[model samples]
Target: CVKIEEVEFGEVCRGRLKQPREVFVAIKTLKVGYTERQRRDFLSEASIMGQFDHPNIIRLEGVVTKSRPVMILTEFMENCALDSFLRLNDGQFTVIQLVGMLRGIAAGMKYLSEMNYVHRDLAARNILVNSNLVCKVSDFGEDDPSDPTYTSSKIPIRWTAPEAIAYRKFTSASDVWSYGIVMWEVMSYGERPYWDMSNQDVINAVEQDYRLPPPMDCPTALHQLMLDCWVRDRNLRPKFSQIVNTLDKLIRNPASLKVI
Candidate 1:
């Protein structure tokens, strides 16, 4: 095992596979929890990840069996998280590029929804974009959508829906809420979510119908979609199928959704 010099975020280790092809792969082990709660979290995470297989979903290459020292192997993506990358690039992405990225994420979420799983913690920080600019969802430690309650402090609160935060049950609608946040995330060139609010505050704000607006240079229609998703009444929110259509239309025809 080769321990690479680390920065503040986490540590990196590069090692050769002992069993298989002896391929040298790098491992990033972030410093997180490790008590019973953490282990249970990790196990559920590993299970959810192991359940799905979509191109936009980061592939879990392998994992160490031992529970004491939990480790997972995945494809090494050179460019780290999507938020930082988008922030670095700023407003460089044209409509087509943004559309493609959104499409990939929507498709990925579609697959997950088909599998009856909700990525409770979907955000730009957990997304990855490779050299090809392919967006893949990563970070499986908090992918809990099983509970009926839409709200949970254990998950990303700001990106969640009021119904989710209040009920603790996360449905496809809550995922859609998170997706809208992601749209805002991409539109703002990766601006932080709920910039000034604490998680509990965000929940309170959501309950009071406090909606988040788009950051600098966010297209008007895209901003509208964010608001639409922010609709407190879960039924009023657009479905993923509808979201895909809406985003596709906005990309292909920003002037209007219908023939205009």
Candidate 2:
């Protein structure tokens, strides 16, 4: 075992394991935990993470709370975040691969929604893919357990819907809006959200109700679906369940969404 770095927040150390599979484990020390309330928050996050299951969500292996700085042991994700991975892989996945990843994530989202949790933030940076290309959703600490969000301040502006910006409300429909951005991210292999635009520019355009266009080589129907999700009226955005069903139908019946 070797020390990597020590920080006021926590320390990341390499676990002492020689074999390739067990070589690089970074132990996250939750040193920020001082008061009972902070400890509770950390425990709650760990519990929430522990309860998550399914192919699309990451697996929480173990947690160590006996020490001053608690730690969580998760399945090692060797690959980088989705965006960086896409940049390295040139933003492309085979049809089978993309569909599988998307469907798995949709299932995860559906489960979360059923439990009245809204992942206020959904972005490529939070998604990790394994060597087998199995995608897993991570980073739920910021989630608001509200079934439907009303405060939109949590979302990334460039990837969020116009109504969310205007009314500061983010419902399941707004989640669909973010889902569309996720689709774009997957399809584009990892294009930056609101590419080449300044934050002010994106905000101005969104306020005026600018819609996102399809990424190059994206299927037509997928583009249409993305547009539907990006609707200016949050109420008009497709439901996550509906999006899942539609995606299922499309994936199962290739004729429906395949590009000619």
Candidate 3:
């Protein structure tokens, strides 16, 4: 919180941490009593993140709650959002490299699931990438820290699971469904999953048993795994462990990397 400089995004500043080895940090603008609910929500997100210590998860450094325009500080990612990063360098990566990125993300999700934490929002846009192409999951929301329920009438449409939108049911299974969409994003190099479909259209299409077609030149096996994630029955979706294992196996065996 020392000598913070404002950034492009509202309520955020980039600053240096003196005691923490002169590292860089991004701080979220804090408005204490900015409505009691928002104050609590902001602190809740920080508290949840502060407890996390995972390679594929963003690390929370500290918080500046004692002063005006309070802020939450965390490690900064250089490459920024995963979607834009892939689109900026489309077709530059081999399928093996893309699978490696997905493997890292799946491992993060696996860790969260094991901790009994449900990431209600799981999508490529919410993932941050580094220069090494290491992707970490970020930007999570919890409706209530006590109960940890998240419900949204205006769903993300393309990235959301059917049951989540239909019945407000969010579980690890729903996260698996969203992870499938992320797989689509990695293979397609950040192509919008539904390509201009309105939210209602996406809802109807999913209800009518439609899933996105394979991304152009995508491997058949990779697309099949995406299909496994979009299964109509949530219970039928593969766990994150299975996803990590499958990608590991694919990377270990190059013969399975056929394009169709």
TM-score of each: 0.76, 0.79, 0.90
Best by lDDT: 3
Model 2 agreement with the true structure over 178-260: per-residue lDDT tens digits: 88888888888877666666656777887776777778777887888888888876777777788788888888788765673
Tens-digit lDDT string for candidate 3 (137-185): 8984122233222325545657889998889788888999999999999
The superposed Cα distance between candidate 1 and the true structure at residue 131, in angstroms, equals: 1.2
Best by TM-score: 3
Return the clash pairs for model 1, or none. Answer: 148-169, 149-167, 149-168, 149-169, 150-164, 150-168, 150-169, 151-164, 151-165, 151-168
For 114-207, candidate 1 gives per-residue lDDT tens digits of: 8887778788887877778999888742232332212434656667777766677799879888988998888778776766565566777777
CA shift at 120, candidate 2, in angstroms?
A: 0.7
State model 1's lDDT.
0.71
Count backbone clashes in candidate 2.
2
lDDT of 2: 0.69
Which runs of model 1 end up more than 4 angstroms from their true locations? 1-44, 66-70, 141-153, 198-201, 254-260
Candidate 2 stretches with Cα past 4 Å from truth are: 1-8, 12-26, 32-40, 140-155
